[PDB]
Amino acid sequence: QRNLGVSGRIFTIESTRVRGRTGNVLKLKVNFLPEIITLSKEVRNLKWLGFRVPLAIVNKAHQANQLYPFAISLIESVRTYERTCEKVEERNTISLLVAGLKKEVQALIAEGIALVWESYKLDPYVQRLAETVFNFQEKVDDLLIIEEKIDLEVRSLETCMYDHKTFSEILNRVQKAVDDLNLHSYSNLPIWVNKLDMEIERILGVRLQAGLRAWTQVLLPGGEPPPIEECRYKLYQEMFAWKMVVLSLPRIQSQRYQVGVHYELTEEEKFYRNALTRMPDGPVALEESYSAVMGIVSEVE
């Protein structure tokens, strides 16, 4: 009554309801029902038991078993696509980087919807879809580990000792992670790093505010900081030593490898000189630093 058999299109985009979503969620399955897979084991097992299986069912079961090796490759290949895409949806941050790889898999799956089980192209196609989806899964798994490292480091900038070498060490580790992303060729890397640069700039701007106020307090989070005109020069020279702790740090670059491709980088692009403008409390903290230098010089004069 079931009329078990395999033929026609290899995929079947079925409609399934997901709780909490009014729209019916479409899911992709290989057009090779589990009942067929159960049928191959059924016929084989009943024969040794001594039951004379009808020859019609042996023909149906035997026909699909010839297509079983391709079916199991697609079922796990398709299932791997679903779970890898599920991992991407969990973390919206890494969505841009896997844009290039997700494009190819949607192209290969787009190719497979046109095929039928009898196509001679099903041999090279199963290996291609199986291989590419494995590449998609491996790169996404690496990205979840690579970005966790970048996320742990950028949060480390908030709560590290206000010394230049410690700040450089954190950005050095963040830079190496970006360089490995550049090698893998995850797409949209320049767009993503720029978002990472602004969040690093914000954190360094906040830390620079604590640096100036802590420097201001010692003069009268923030670390442990001749004629009359020389005293003013010495105080500002000391402040520039404190200000350059953060503003002299290297700027995270997204295309460190594209070398020989000549685009000149200005001083602003090389370092976080603009981080002074990203203080949370506006330029108020910078004024207090300059004012305190004016106050001491006023008293000495």
Binding site: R9, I13, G23, V25, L26, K27, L28, C85, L96, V98, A99, G100, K102, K103, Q106, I109, A110, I113, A114, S187, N188, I191
Partner: peptide, 21 residues
């Protein structure tokens, strides 16, 4: 910014391609 299509819209498009064939 090259952006991958969402799974739902992509599968709707593929359904439209498949049914009309």
């Amino acid at each position: 910014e090259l952006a991958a299509e969402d799974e739902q819209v992509f599968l709707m498009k593929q359904q439209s391609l498949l049914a009309k064939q």
